[PDB]
Structures are given as structure tokens and as C-alpha cells.
């Protein structure tokens with residue numbers, strides 16, 4: 001019962017602790033997902049070693065060879081026993097990996113600047129002066145890539161024509177793109193809440209375009225999946241997931 005847990009750096013889910021003296025092993029990290037992993041470990045009774053996903057991606061399937069990358073691929077390859085991260089539960093992913101029930105719910109929305117006349121995805125879709133995109137090889141990118149809704153297909157045609165420019169490596173790169181250029185970022189609503197509380201000139205535009213949840217990923221057939229679902233439901237009912245979110249979102253900014 002010693003497990004390897006894969007994750008990815010993403011504020012406020014997983015971040016390096018700030019320390020004068022270097023820290024080692026799991027002690028290096030903090031954040032909402034680290035707190036969740038600690039609780040799961042206590043409830044389920046396993047120890048673990050946190051590994052950061054080597055390719056730095058959440059996970060998407062290659063058009064050409066059907067192969068996955070990112071944390072999803074780490075689970076398929078058995079490089080990790082669990083992925084404890086803001087990993088979106090999606091039908092395409094469910095075909096190759098298992099997820100616990102969700103520990104947080106959210107949807108794709110738009111991060112942009114306040115006071116503009118952009119009010120929705122439809123407003124972005126119909127123009128080209130304001131660029132827009134998403135994190136490369138993550139769920140939001142895959143949503144647009146596969147959607148048959150005209151508005152979202154129109155946005156994918158745009159994003160996919162300027163991929164090198166608008167599809168970014170991380171939420172951090174997308175936030176900087178928003179701050180340094182005329183760009184709207186398609187990102188998950190939980191993360192937008194965090195970002196806008198720290199940059200008062202930024203805001204969510206429109207509502208949630210879809211609805212999904214984050215769950216702990218496991219290789220298909222893992223005995224840990226059902227046990228982790230049970231632990232999450234218990235944490236949820238006890239109010240612990242709500243406290244954890246307040247602790248890291250610090251709804252104090254702005």
C-alpha cells in the first residue's frame with residue numbers, strides 16, 4: 001500500500017511551498033489537491049510519493065495515432081497509481097481511465113478584462129481582433145475540438161488556425177496572455193474564480209459553457225477508485241471539501 005501519485009503544478013491546487021531552505025519529497029508541495037491527497041491517505045491508509053507529470057500535460061488524444069499524453073497517459077501506462085489534480089472527468093477520458101466521483105464541480109467559462117462589450121462566447125466567435133484560446137492538450141481544448149455546436153466549432157476553427165499563438169502550455173501562460181495582449185482565455189470556472197480575486201481588472205465573461213467535475217484518476221479497474229469515491233463523499237458531507245476550497249481560494253482578494 002505505497003502508491004505513486006501523479007499531479008501537475010497549478011495554483012491553488014498544487015504549488016511549490018515557499019521556503020528559505022530547500023524542502024524534499026512530498027514536503028515540497030502544498031495546495032488544495034495536496035490537502036485532499038493527505039485526507040485520502042488518512043482515510044484509506046496508504047502512503048505515497050508525489051511525482052509531477054513528466055510531459056506537463058493533463059491529457060489529450062493524438063489525432064494521428066490515437067495515443068494519449070499527460071496525466072491520463074501516465075495512468076494508462078501504470079507509471080502512477082492515482083492522479084490527484086484538477087483533472088476533468090470527461091466521457092473520452094472515461095474510455096481509457098477510471099475516475100472517482102467528483103470532488104469539485106465547474107464548467108468552462110471565459111477569463112477576460114472588465115468593461116468590454118464581450119458578453120459571451122458568441123461575441124468572441126464572430127470576430128478575430130480579440131484572440132482567444134485554451135490550454136493545449138487539456139479538456140477545454142478537447143471540448144472545442146470535438147463540439148458540433150456551431151459557435152464552438154467556429155471557435156475551434158479559429159484556435160486551430162492560430163494554435164502556436166493561442167493554445168498555451170498552462171493556465172499561467174493564458175493569464176499572462178490575457179494581461180499582456182488582447183486575448184480572452186477559455187478556462188475552468190473554479191480557476192477563474194481564483195484568478196479574478198487576485199487581478200481585479202479581470203473577470204469571468206458569460207456563464208458556464210458546460211458542466212463537469214474534477215475527480216481522482218486511476219488506471220481502469222483500480223480497486224482504489226470506489227474507495228476514493230467513498231472517502232470523497234465522506235469529506236464532502238463533513239464539510240471538509242468546502243473548507244479546503246475556502247482555505248485555498250481565500251475569498252478575501254478584491
Ligand SMILES: N[C@@H](CCC(=O)O)C(=O)O
Nearest residue numbers: 058086087088138139140
Ligand atoms: N483541468 C483541465 C486542464 C485545464 C483546461 O483544459 O482548461 C484538464 O483536466 O484537462
